[PDB]
Structures are given as C-alpha cells and as structure tokens.
Coordinates of C-alpha atoms in Angstrom, one line a residue:
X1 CA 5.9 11.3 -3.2
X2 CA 5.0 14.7 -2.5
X3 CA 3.6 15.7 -5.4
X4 CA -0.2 17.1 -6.8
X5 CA -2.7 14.2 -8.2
X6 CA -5.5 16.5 -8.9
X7 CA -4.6 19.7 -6.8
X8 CA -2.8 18.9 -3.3
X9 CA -2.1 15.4 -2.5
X10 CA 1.5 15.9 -0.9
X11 CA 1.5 12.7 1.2
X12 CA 5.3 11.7 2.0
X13 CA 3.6 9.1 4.9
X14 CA 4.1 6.2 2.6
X15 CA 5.4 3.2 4.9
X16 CA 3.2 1.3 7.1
X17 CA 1.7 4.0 9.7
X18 CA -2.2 4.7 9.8
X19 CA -2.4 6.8 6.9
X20 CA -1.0 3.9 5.0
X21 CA -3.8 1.9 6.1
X22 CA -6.3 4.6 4.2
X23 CA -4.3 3.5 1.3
X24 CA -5.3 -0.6 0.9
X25 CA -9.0 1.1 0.5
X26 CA -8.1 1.8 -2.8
X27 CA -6.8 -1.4 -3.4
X28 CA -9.9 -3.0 -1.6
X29 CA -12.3 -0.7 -3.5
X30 CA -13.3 -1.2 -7.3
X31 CA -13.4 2.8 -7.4
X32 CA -9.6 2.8 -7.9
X33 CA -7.7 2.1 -10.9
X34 CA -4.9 -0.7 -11.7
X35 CA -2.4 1.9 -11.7
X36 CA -3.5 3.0 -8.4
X37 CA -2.8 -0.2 -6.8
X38 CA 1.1 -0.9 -8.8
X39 CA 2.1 2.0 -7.0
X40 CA 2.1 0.1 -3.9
X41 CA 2.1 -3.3 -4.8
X42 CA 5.8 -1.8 -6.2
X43 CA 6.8 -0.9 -2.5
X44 CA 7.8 -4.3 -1.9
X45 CA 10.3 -3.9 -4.7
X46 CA 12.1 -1.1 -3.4
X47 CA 11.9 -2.1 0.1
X48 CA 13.5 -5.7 -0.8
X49 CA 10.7 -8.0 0.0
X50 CA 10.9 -11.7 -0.8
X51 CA 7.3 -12.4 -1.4
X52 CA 3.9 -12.3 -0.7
X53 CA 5.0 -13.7 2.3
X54 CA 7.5 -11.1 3.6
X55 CA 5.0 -8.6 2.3
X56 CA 2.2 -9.4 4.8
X57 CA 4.0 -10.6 7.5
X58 CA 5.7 -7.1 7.3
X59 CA 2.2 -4.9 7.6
X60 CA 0.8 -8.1 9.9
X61 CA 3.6 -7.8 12.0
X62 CA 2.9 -4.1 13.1
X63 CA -0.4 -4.9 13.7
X64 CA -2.0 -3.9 10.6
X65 CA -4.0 -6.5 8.1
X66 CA -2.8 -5.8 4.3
X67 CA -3.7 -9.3 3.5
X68 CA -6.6 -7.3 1.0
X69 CA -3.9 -5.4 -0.5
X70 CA -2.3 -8.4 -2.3
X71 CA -5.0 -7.4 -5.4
X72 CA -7.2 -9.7 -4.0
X73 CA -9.9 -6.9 -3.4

C-alpha cells in the first residue's frame, strides 16, 4: 500500500473510511485507467466478499454509496 505512484502516494487508508470514498472517483471518472479500478474491485477478494451484493451492502452499510464503483462509471 504505502508505496510511490509518481513521487509520494503512501496511502495505507485503504478500507472504507472517507479517503476511500476519494477513491470510487477514479472508478467514476474516465480519467482513470482499467488498472486503476482492478486494484479495488480486487479488495473484495481479499476481504472474502460473496458478490456484488456483499460488496455494496458492505460500503452501503457504513453509510457510504459505492454502487458507481461496480465499473459501472
């Protein structure tokens, strides 16, 4: 996680907190890349996720609306 993308990116707040919302803008935004939105679209596989389902009722659930983040933006 912590790591440099193009200088200083160290972000280790990769969960389902606020800065994690900034994230779905990439995967709501064209200006990203498809590789940009695997790296979180593979959270689900690490975290044990059953679906689509589980998925967004997880962010939903905290009060956050990922239902954009589903490549569907």
């Amino acid at each position: 996680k912590c790591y440099s993308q193009n200088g200083l990116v160290l972000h280790c707040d990769a969960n389902f907190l606020e800065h994690e919302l900034s994230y779905i803008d990439v995967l709501l935004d064209k200006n990203a890349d498809q590789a940009t939105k695997d790296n979180l679209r593979s959270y689900f596989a690490d975290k044990g996720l059953h679906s689509i389902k589980d998925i967004i009722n997880k962010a939903k659930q905290d009060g956050f609306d990922v239902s954009k983040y589903e490549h569907v933006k």
